[PDB]
Design a protein around this ligand. Structure first.
Ligand SMILES: O=P(O)(O)O[C@H]1[C@H](OP(=O)(O)O)[C@@H](OP(=O)(O)O)[C@H](OP(=O)(O)O)[C@@H](OP(=O)(O)O)[C@H]1OP(=O)(O)O
Ligand SMILES: O=P(O)(O)O[C@H]1[C@H](OP(=O)(O)O)[C@@H](OP(=O)(O)O)[C@H](OP(=O)(O)O)[C@@H](OP(=O)(O)O)[C@H]1OP(=O)(O)O
Lengths: 221, 221, 221, 221
């Protein structure tokens, strides 16, 4: 991340060892469950591309996931280069140059360049964009590692309704379908795959019932 | 949160990555149990509205809970605007303006505005009010996610009395009934739903026995 | 329909009794299956609004379906009136007036008016629009009368794959989901609900396999 | 189709509603069995491309079959354009222009153009060629929808020989193998897959026995 020294200057600060160890635990203990994605977003808060690559080195041990991440990052960098062509001409002395795809990801750039790019009025977030590419890669990995399809999430005969809803929504978050498809799933498949008692109650509740009403009517069933 | 620099000026400090990761773990691992509410109150201690929105982004993955939170926040903001009309007239140069409902929640305000609003003599807490709205939303979510009714909390035939009391009071905290209703529950339903031996002992103890006496008389039963 | 007399003039021709009897058989024998919709479209080919109302009189015996049709027609007529306001001013002697919502459906118009409206260069199809409203109503009825959800269409242990595909697509046509949802269904649910042998083969076939390849690989299984 | 008016002029006549309904019944009730192909050829006798598209609208409900038909028609139109290049130069006033691939199928042409093209001395059949393309598409669909391979057509232990022959030849018509392969099938596989008594009789009959002799020798077996 970026901090301020006693002179009021922006200086890069390395990720603390225990934050890196928390990220390592997340990678090595959660088997790329969907919750890995928010946690990363919390653990890389306000990070620099060098810090993001340091965090990615933990994923580098997982060869398949690391390869998927590298493919996603390369594709995003190519798209960024395509959408941000290198302008030919004079550059203002007070304005910094435009980083390339290999520079925003920190493969070739230096620390001072990223510090200057991130701290500006208005700021151009390179760390945030690299983080978004990382999150895209992580979402792909979570989809790859999902053990069950949403069509296979069925409420158990004695399973409480809240646990079934939690499993259903966790699987839905893992699968990352289209928004309309997700809405159709939450409206139809959740009722369809419930156990007979909750299914009867939800059918009696009618279409268009909110999730709160559904969980209320099935609370102790 | 807000800290003081070497110049004695109030400056916003971002939430540390491990605090955000602790909040992420709370959201993603505790299934909106009642204890999520104190923990949030601990983890957002002295926070700014921007920090509170950063913490809410973790809840944003949970679509139903996020929608309930957004509804509660919008209702609270509308009530705040209704109870705090925008005064038309001159404003003192030394007195800051009054934030609106979309400004206290940090949807439209800036960091410097919130820093100035929170640090004053006397202070007007915007972060605390936003936190209270968040806690209202979280209480609604905990009520929604409660798996069992208080009427269904019954002591097991071999369950120790202290565990039954703990489950009963946890469910009572989840349900959030009216204060008189809660008092009636703790006075009558706790005795009513106990197992036969503890029920006999508590009936012999008589009405109006304190919880300490009840747990004493049933300690090893 | 409309025919030409020996004088070269457009004259309305009534629907033949056996065409009406075919429509009656479709209504009374097919229980509003999806195939009722193409057949109607074939049987009302080039029809006038009076003819369409004559055909609807067969549906009028089915009270619920007739009420749904009347609701759909009234809604479509109201939308047509909203989108086609009655212009105030002179009307060309050679140009016919604009029919209203109650006039295109033939509730108040006469035969000569519809004959003149339909036969023009360029023609303004009133019979076709009324037919489209009828088809909307019929689609609603078919959705209402569908006996099974698409989620409940599962291949039998000894059922041939082509029959399962036919049932699946018939149910999909009955349900009339959104196009993206329909694509998701045909891509995922068809494989998901197949019997174990065909399911194994289709999983080996991989995602993105065309329906022809799927039916080929499962032909005799 | 095309009829003659009282003035001796060729005028297009629309397909009667009951012919269209017969075609709809064929499409929706026969599951693309091989007999759908002769029936279509009977029902579209002397039809125009606009009429053929009207008949295809019934198939348009069957999404996979409609897509296969559209692919076949587009391929045939491309081949027709390749084999019939647009000549650059003068055109005789008494000779009509050459329709393109999108014009013979009636996607862009008009009714009068097709009427003039079809009625000529000598006539250039555009409806017949479009019908042949439709029949190619339908043959592809029938091959796709065939439930059993010809190798899986085996005479039942008590099945009469004529029924086995009928099933065998129906499957052979569905599969549409090469002519030499079809001859090999009818000569060898029919005897190979018969039940033991008929198989013994046919083996005694010898190679090169005609189908009439085979059905005679196995009539009551
Ligand atoms: O979410 P928190 O409540 O802040 O939990 C943390 C977390 O512990 P867990 O993830 O095991 O719950 C830290 O683990 P790290 O991933 O950073 O390693 C751990 O730090 P240690 O690594 O040093 O164990 C720390 O424990 P400590 O209090 O000893 O600093 C502990 O905080 P709490 O103990 O306050 O829960
Ligand atoms: O092959 P055909 O003997 O001429 O059969 C037709 C055919 O009936 P089926 O296909 O049910 O055997 C017609 O059905 P369409 O497909 O044209 O609808 C039907 O006409 P309807 O639709 O009006 O039932 C007509 O019956 P009708 O005699 O009432 O005209 C009937 O002819 P036959 O009754 O002479 O068999």
């Amino acid at each position: 991340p970026i901090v301020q020294n006693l002179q009021g200057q922006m200086v890069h600060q390395a990720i603390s060892p225990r934050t890196l160890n928390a990220w390592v635990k997340v990678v090595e203990e959660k088997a790329f469950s969907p919750e890995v994605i928010p946690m990363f977003s919390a653990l890389s808060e306000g990070a620099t591309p060098q810090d993001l690559n340091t965090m990615l080195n933990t994923v580098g041990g997982h060869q398949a996931a690391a390869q998927m991440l590298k493919e996603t990052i390369n594709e995003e960098a190519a798209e960024w280069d395509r959408l941000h062509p290198v302008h030919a001409g004079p550059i203002a002395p007070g304005q910094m140059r435009e980083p390339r795809g290999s520079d925003i990801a920190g493969t070739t750039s230096t620390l001072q360049e990223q510090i200057g790019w991130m701290t500006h009025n208005p700021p151009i977030p390179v760390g945030e964009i690299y983080k978004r590419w990382i999150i895209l890669g992580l979402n792909k990995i979570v989809r790859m590692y999902s053990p069950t399809s949403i069509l296979d999430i069925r409420q158990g005969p004695k399973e409480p309704f809240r646990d079934y809803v939690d499993r259903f929504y966790k699987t839905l978050r893992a699968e990352q379908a289209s928004q309309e498809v997700k809405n159709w799933m939450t409206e139809t498949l959740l009722v369809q795959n419930a156990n007979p008692d909750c299914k009867t109650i939800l059918k009696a509740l009618g279409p268009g019932a909110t999730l709160e009403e559904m969980m209320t009517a099935c609370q102790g069933v």
